[PDB]
Amino acid sequence: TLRAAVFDLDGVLALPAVFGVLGRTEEALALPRGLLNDAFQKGGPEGATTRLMKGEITLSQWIPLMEENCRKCSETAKVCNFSIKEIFDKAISARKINRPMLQAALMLRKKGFTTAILTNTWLDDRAERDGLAQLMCELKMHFDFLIESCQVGMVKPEPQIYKFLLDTLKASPSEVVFLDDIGANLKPARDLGMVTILVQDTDTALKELEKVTGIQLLNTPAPLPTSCNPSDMSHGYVTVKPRVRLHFVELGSGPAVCLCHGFPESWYSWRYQIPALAQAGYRVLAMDMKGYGESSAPPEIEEYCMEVLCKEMVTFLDKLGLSQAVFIGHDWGGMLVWYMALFYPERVRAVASLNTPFIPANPNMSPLESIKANPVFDYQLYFQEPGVAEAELEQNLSRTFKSLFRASDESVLSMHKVAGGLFVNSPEEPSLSRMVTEEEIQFYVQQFKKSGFRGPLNWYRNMERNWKWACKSLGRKILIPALMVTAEKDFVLVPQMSQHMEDWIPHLKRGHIEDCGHWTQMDKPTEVNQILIKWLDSDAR
Amino acid sequence: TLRAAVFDLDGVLALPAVFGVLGRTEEALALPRGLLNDAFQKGGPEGATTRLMKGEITLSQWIPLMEENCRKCSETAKVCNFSIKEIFDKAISARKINRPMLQAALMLRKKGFTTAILTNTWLDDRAERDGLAQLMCELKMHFDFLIESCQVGMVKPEPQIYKFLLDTLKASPSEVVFLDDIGANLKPARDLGMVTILVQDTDTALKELEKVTGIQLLNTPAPLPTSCNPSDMSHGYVTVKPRVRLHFVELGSGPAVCLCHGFPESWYSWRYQIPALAQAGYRVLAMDMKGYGESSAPPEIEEYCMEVLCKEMVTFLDKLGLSQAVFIGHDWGGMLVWYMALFYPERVRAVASLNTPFIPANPNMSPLESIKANPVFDYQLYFQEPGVAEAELEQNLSRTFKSLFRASDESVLSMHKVAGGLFVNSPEEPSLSRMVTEEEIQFYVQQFKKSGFRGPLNWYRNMERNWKWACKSLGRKILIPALMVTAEKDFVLVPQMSQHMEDWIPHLKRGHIEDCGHWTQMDKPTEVNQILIKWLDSDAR
Numbered sequence A, B: 001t002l003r004a005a006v007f008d009l010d011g012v013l014a015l016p017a018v019f020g021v022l023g024r025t026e027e028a029l030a031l032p033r034g035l036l037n038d039a040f041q042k043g044g045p046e047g048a049t050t051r052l053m054k055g056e057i058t059l060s061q062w063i064p065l066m067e068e069n070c071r072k073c074s075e076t077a078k079v080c081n082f083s084i085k086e087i088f089d090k091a092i093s094a095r096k097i098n099r100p101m102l103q104a105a106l107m108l109r110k111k112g113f114t115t116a117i118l119t120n121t122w123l124d125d126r127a128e129r130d131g132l133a134q135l136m137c138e139l140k141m142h143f144d145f146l147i148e149s150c151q152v153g154m155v156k157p158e159p160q161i162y163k164f165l166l167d168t169l170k171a172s173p174s175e176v177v178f179l180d181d182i183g184a185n186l187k188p189a190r191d192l193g194m195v196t197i198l199v200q201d202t203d204t205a206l207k208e209l210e211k212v213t214g215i216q217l218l219n220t221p222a223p224l225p226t227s228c229n230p231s232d233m234s235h236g237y238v239t240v241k242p243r244v245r246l247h248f249v250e251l252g253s254g255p256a257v258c259l260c261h262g263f264p265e266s267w268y269s270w271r272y273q274i275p276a277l278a279q280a281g282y283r284v285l286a287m288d289m290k291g292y293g294e295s296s297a298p299p300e301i302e303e304y305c306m307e308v309l310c311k312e313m314v315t316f317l318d319k320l321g322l323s324q325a326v327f328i329g330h331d332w333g334g335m336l337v338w339y340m341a342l343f344y345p346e347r348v349r350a351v352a353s354l355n356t357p358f359i360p361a362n363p364n365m366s367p368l369e370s371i372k373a374n375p376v377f378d379y380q381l382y383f384q385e386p387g388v389a390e391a392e393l394e395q396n397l398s399r400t401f402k403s404l405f406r407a408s409d410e411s412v413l414s415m416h417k418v419a420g421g422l423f424v425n426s427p428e429e430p431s432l433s434r435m436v437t438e439e440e441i442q443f444y445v446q447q448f449k450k451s452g453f454r455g456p457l458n459w460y461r462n463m464e465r466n467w468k469w470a471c472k473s474l475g476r477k478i479l480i481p482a483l484m485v486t487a488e489k490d491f492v493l494v495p496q497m498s499q500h501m502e503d504w505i506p507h508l509k510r511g512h513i514e515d516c517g518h519w520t521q522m523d524k525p526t527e528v529n530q531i532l533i534k535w536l537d538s539d540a541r
């Protein structure tokens, strides 16, 4: 039975094939048929191309040798602005990930298959080498192995590369499916006993792959975006003051994008956004906000007022040597992010909030008076008394997260009349939401075992201090780039609460997600990524 | 006696003053004298500018209100393409750090003074606000406190801001020197009992400051570049394989610049480069190389062959989501960096080496044969036998680092005929080199207490494996941007050893440091920064 799948890069995992450019240049330039493909493979196993593919020489060294072969091939054929460099630069740049092939590779791996890329490639030292470096990076991370001819000094169709592939896979030939667009390179794999697919069009190739593996790969439901494996991330730590350190997860290059979670969450709440935003060209810093996970959680209520939290996020930027970051927040993090824009606009490249609207402080009313004027916020009153909510929330962490993290139609908690507790008529063993796996709930369980709910709950215990501080901003407007993302089915932070935001943020941009509950990032990850990337590319650079 | 120094920003720590632009625009536009300064301060303590300075309104809200004041001031004066926005953008952009004033502030702090910036400023929400954010960031980090009028809701010359300043300084007025370019803002400080300086020209101001403090501030020797306080850096951690994690220090934004130390060093060996390179517009990643500091140090010799080290640095980039980084190395790190360029050019934006030349492997000679053909490398033979060098180097860490880290004319170790040990006729209590403080030696002592010298020494114990791996690259050339930096007085990695590098790196750029020993970064930090920044800006973007 098959347990390994091997894919070629050019013309299999990446399209259009770099090989299909020589034939295209031939037709465009009205050159003799196969002329450029003849100069390319000249000398066979002893030629310049085999030397390049084995890593003996780099691409920049090979370019002049290819030109020589192009001259000799035109002299024999009796024929005659021409640049191999230009042709190849254009060909590499045009070559994109073959999404349905990657999706199929992703599905096989998810089902227990060991996946690998086996490719005849080169050491790219061109001034424009970054394009391919980016492509290889996005691709490679989805596979167990990447075997490149130039790193192993072996090439397809040499028998040794196939035995090397079996060795790294730790599998017998009959347990391997091998996909290649070049028939000759497919031959030695078949000779060993491997299942082989000659890839012409992706569709038929996947039909062939689906038949041999017995796994549905074609016509499957829309896959979720790439998530994060905590142990595979870069973890960063910044001391903002003697007793306070902030932890973050960091991925990508480009403008700094600081992600700020809500209550009672984690940097992990952004798991579906981190790979997408990094791939989109941003340097993502996903925080553990103060009171959470690996960040410090002092016990004092006043350590959690908006003024202190914002000041520390400024210090976080100072210590990392960042003059600005785009700030994206959800729930309490969304509230933090609006106050970062109001008090520190010079440090905020752009601001976005998921669910949390910007409602200015009412100077003619106490926050306690304002809260009582809405049944949806009654839970915030239950959070006031130190110790009460901590006791119920810390009692059973698995039940706490399983009850909280649910889609709109999966409601288990009765948030009105909080009876005497959040879990009044809630099951002791709630079912697992379609939004989360058991493993994901257990990550939140493990994070919350360090500091519990005290620090997180203290974010709600500074109403009076927050109101007084916020009143200092009443004459201001948010004039830096801003995005408000509303969730149709969030019944606490309702889209309707954001209706007057334009009065204070005149140039405000908007996004809206239908059939989406409170936990926006994991409820609708694909749509959050689409909205954020589109807004970042237009308004944050 | 004075123990605190307070400086204004505009016209004191930053020049030319934003105030000096209105008078300049007046003359250029041939407008009535003081017209633009009249519109600016219109309404006094109740006017738009006081509201802006207190943080009631942002700069973008104030711009239209200033235009109104400009209209009313021209109607009364009976006068008539004009943009306040354009004038202010140009003025802010032109305003640079007043280096001798910053230097004087730096000297006072080094001598035990508490330093602060007290400034009348605004909440900058302009599209070009980053310029000032960068300026404030570079400046602020050199002072104990930054007091901004718009954050405290108080303004100079209001008495309360002065009492607030005394409160934050925790000092009585007579213990404070206050420097300001506006006479009126100097007045309340004098009234309290503070020493005050009216700053017109920087030179006289510093003469006045030097006289009152009794500290030489004018005509002082060239200061060293800013260093790093370990506890104030962002520390990053990446697991590259199950038993191997790499630690790094991270500072700045822009293209990724990965710094690779030599033997027996630390990320801290780059302490003078990290702030300079970040300020120059780069995102610096200063590594603890495998076997050092907070990075993993497995005991096996083969965990330290160049092939494995390079593969792990590629994984380090993969996990951080970096398609490329410029690699800058010193000593063993310089050797690593040339092999990164030869084996992974697609991941190397540009390569630079301090001291370590690129000499290709001799395929007709054993590394043991090659080493014996030079007295300078005899120390590498002494490093071969596992346990021998570890025992002597680990015996007394303080003596180890004090003996090693020395300038060219301070030589204490007799590196030829290594007698039977590196410390044969070396003092047990060596003197402290002019290059290092006791505190700095103790940092290296504390780092080396975790894993000792085994891992670091294993970098020398893979000669045969490294030679075989290197022979695979003999037909290649380094064609990506490259820099070779030679140190006149390094007697092991002599500048002469780099003479043939052009044969393998045709486009190689060069730097040379006179009167510089082996420990390049701390021996000549100012010149290393100049060479690296100039090369990064021209060849790495």
Ligand SMILES: O=C1Cc2ccc(Br)cc2N1
Binding pocket: A306, A335, A359, A360, A361, A362, A466, A467, A470
């Ligand atoms: O409606 C409001 C007013 C307000 C001010 C400050 C903070 Br933090 C949160 C809120 N919520």
Ligand SMILES: O=C1Cc2ccc(Br)cc2N1
Binding pocket: A366, A367, A368, A370, A371, A460, A462, A463, A464, A466, A467
């Ligand atoms: O911290 C705060 C201040 C505040 C004011 C009003 C309302 Br409703 C909620 C909150 N939360």
Ligand SMILES: O=C1Cc2ccc(Br)cc2N1
Binding pocket: B306, B335, B359, B360, B361, B362, B466, B467, B470
């Ligand atoms: O001269 C040489 C040849 C060589 C090859 C590989 C490594 Br790592 C270091 C060195 N030094």
Ligand SMILES: O=C1Cc2ccc(Br)cc2N1
Binding pocket: B366, B367, B368, B370, B371, B460, B462, B463, B464, B466, B467
């Ligand atoms: O690791 C190595 C390989 C090698 C080859 C030659 C010389 Br000299 C030094 C070294 N060091």
